[PDB]
Design a protein around this ligand. Sequence first.
Ligand SMILES: O[C@@H]1[C@@H](O)[C@H](O[C@@H]2CO[C@@H](O[C@@H]3CO[C@H](O)[C@H](O)[C@H]3O)[C@H](O)[C@H]2O)OC[C@H]1O
Length: 324
Amino acid sequence: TIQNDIPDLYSVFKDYFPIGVAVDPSRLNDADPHAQLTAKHFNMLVAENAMKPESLQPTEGNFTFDNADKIVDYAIAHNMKMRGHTLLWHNQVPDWFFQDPSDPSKPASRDLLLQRLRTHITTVLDHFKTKYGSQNPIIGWDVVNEVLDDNGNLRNSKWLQIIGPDYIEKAFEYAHEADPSMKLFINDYNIENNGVKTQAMYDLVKKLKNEGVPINGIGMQMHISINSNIDNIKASIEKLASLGVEIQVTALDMNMNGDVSNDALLKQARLYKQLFDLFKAEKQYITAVVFWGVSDDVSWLSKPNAPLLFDSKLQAKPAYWAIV
Ligand SMILES: O[C@@H]1[C@@H](O)[C@H](O[C@@H]2CO[C@@H](O[C@@H]3CO[C@H](O)[C@H](O)[C@H]3O)[C@H](O)[C@H]2O)OC[C@H]1O
């Protein structure tokens, strides 16, 4: 049972940016405590899995939008905005995209993979626009997800192998052409550490924007840990923001490295407070902050963990109180 009378989390940040959460379509019923926590605390929603490539086009031409639409319907019913996650990734993407259809033992050509990418992107964006029109809550999409490797080079996924380095620019071109009203993001993890990957993201976006690629923002996943350095996060935000793009914190959670003790929860509260003070200070750049999961019991991180503001019993944790 949730605490109904404590402050609605997103309301605390009304003068800064929307506060969202990634959800599962099976946790949206009015009688479900997870759905109650969702509607109470967040004014933005993201599909944790239902809008990924495999979740939308499992086999070629066979589009499965029911779960995604259930989430969109819920966002509309609760006056929430949404982020679309994600049009291209190297995980949760079906193998058929990369296979020659006449000989599945061989790879698709650059032109065929690009055509499939264009058809996927266009169908996905046209689906939400035609079904929901002006009521479409989605304000932007993670057009590409995790395209850098941890050394800062382009990740050598099948997209890169088959097409080459311009597959990123093409994804953005296709998305922009399908729906120019959507803000287009490049999303990634570890770019908040002010290391080689942060520099590579800055370099890549600088390059693509100078070439006219329609990138509107950079999504910083923010899968931080109890040991993360706030100074590095501030420096990363400032560096990426210098490109003149929006910054969104897209998948925030805190890895406790196995320590879920009361002492650790207090340390987590101090760190989350510092993190949100930083986000508020950078409000001129940050346009959304989204948590990757509603409560600890439904977090994607393996156990034991305590990554979010609501615990495994759906109760507000010390970090929630520290922030509000
Ligand atoms: O077995 C499969 C699971 O492994 C899968 O788990 C999801 C994996 O993707 C996570 O979201 C990513 C978290 O990291 C970054 O933020 C990415 O951008 C996200 O996409 C989900 O949280 C997990 O639920 O689910 C499907 C199942 O078949």
